[PDB]
Design a protein around this ligand. Sequence first.
Ligand SMILES: CC(C)(C)OC(=O)N[C@@H](Cc1ccccc1)[C@H](O)CNC[C@@H](O)[C@H](Cc1ccccc1)NC(=O)OC(C)(C)C
Lengths: 99, 99
Amino acid sequence: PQITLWQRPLVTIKIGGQLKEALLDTGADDTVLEEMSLPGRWKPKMIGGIGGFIKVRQYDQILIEICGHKTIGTVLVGPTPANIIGRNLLTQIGCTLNF
Amino acid sequence: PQITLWQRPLVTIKIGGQLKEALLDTGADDTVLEEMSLPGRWKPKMIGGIGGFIKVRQYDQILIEICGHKTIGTVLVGPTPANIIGRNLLTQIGCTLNF
Ligand SMILES: CC(C)(C)OC(=O)N[C@@H](Cc1ccccc1)[C@H](O)CNC[C@@H](O)[C@H](Cc1ccccc1)NC(=O)OC(C)(C)C
């Protein structure tokens, strides 16, 4: 798809049998999702966004199907105001920014 | 330009006659820059991000040059860790996301 930015770039993802809407975020290095029951061993980690830090659980080699494309990567789960898809997965779908 | 996401999508901007580097951020509704010296009136405003909220000052009608293109918009100035170009200026340079 081609997506213009008059509105938030939101897309449907499927993670761990669950359906979610997430934001295509080119300013996000990492992918971070609201708290969810994701299976496996995760590792605690702190991340910094515009207003300070949040502790997250780091889960590796997780399958995420984004707008239909299957991607595998590291997903952080924590208290975030929004489900963000960052650069670690955007590179996988071959997403480019154009102007 | 075509920009891939293997790296942070950074661009050079000129504002209030100072040269700065900023992130193309599709996940941000707004534009927000580190603490700088800008002329005119402003208004206190709190924004919400990951980690919590920050107090910024809003300036409207501010000229900005993005990767050598002109735009006029609202700019929020605060203690952001990074200079962020959000969807309010991105729609102006005609930027889109492709995948
Ligand atoms: C998630 C993380 C891996 C921590 O990356 C960032 O937070 N990256 C920042 C750049 C940055 C890096 C390091 C430290 C500080 C800032 C971008 O603004 C990320 N895009 C912004 C988007 O995630 C966020 C989505 C959102 C939606 C609803 C509520 C809160 C937040 N919008 C966002 O923060 O927008 C404003 C800047 C306008 C507050």
